[PDB]
Symmetry: C4
């Protein structure tokens, strides 16, 4: 099908928005007052939290560019998440017939 195969495949987009932005923000925040982001595994952690729209605060991109990227990496894991929730609704109705 789709709603079942598509949702399963767009999470695999999520890794992309996570691994990408990590190794992207981090070379925008490499040289500067940038928080503990100047690190790649640091960033990888950030995006992870960010992905879940958590927002601990422990870290965050300060660089104008790192900042934008963020915006991207969070949309990623909400856009990505609303999908699961949408497959979920269609699946619940599939048997409601």
């Amino acid at each position: 099908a789709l709603h079942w195969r598509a949702a399963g495949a767009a999470t695999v987009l999520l890794v992309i928005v996570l691994l990408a932005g990590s190794y992207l923000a981090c070379l925008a925040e490499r040289g500067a007052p940038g928080a503990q982001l100047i690190t790649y595994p640091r960033a990888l952690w950030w995006s992870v939290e960010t992905a879940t729209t958590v927002g601990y605060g422990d870290l965050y991109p300060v660089t104008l560019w790192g900042r934008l990227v963020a915006v991207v990496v969070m949309v990623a894991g909400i856009t990505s998440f609303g999908l699961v929730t949408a497959a979920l609704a269609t699946w619940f109705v599939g048997r409601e017939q």
Copy 2:
């Protein structure tokens, strides 16, 4: 359509909303013990991180007014998002035929 173009539109809608709170927040907070909520280009990243419902904490309006606005600015990001979810939802439904 609607459930597809009405969400296309509410997204484009919200963006302006973010800008609103931004220069509404920040005239509210730009004259007091307020935090970085004084400069325009900050509130931007503020309204952004606020809408997505992350809440690092790095910045956070103090004034009562800057505060309502926020309350407004959050709801925007949630409602705006809940649409895209509903849009996704039915578009999965529209493959039940």
Copy 3:
């Protein structure tokens, strides 16, 4: 209707819960090494951010009771809102005709 007036009514309940936990958590966090969670108008601002599950971190309860109210409110946030997402979901179907 329902999905359209049960949501329009359940926000009222969510609004009530804020006003509830606010003047509730506050006497739980009154006396004792607790953040500004002592004032009445202080918690109110935390509810808005709590209900929507923002998590600035600027304010939060630490007393086993103070904490209980929190969890009770946030579940109200996330709840009161999944409704308006599901009001929106079905309204996007009611024009499948």
Copy 4:
């Protein structure tokens, strides 16, 4: 039913989940530069704000493992919730008849 019992059921299962990661977490991050993740009862309040998607910032583990775990924990919260959303949407839709 299903969409009503399945979600009733995933909530109870989710509640049990948080506990798992909590004593699973607190053991990963109980003996190092770790914050307040050493105490069992703390982690409870950690997972709980965590699985909700809040992210106050007052605490946060950093042990690679306690961390990986967390990523597991958020997913629980959102997933668990996305259910309640699909069920609410279907229950509100099954009233069109």
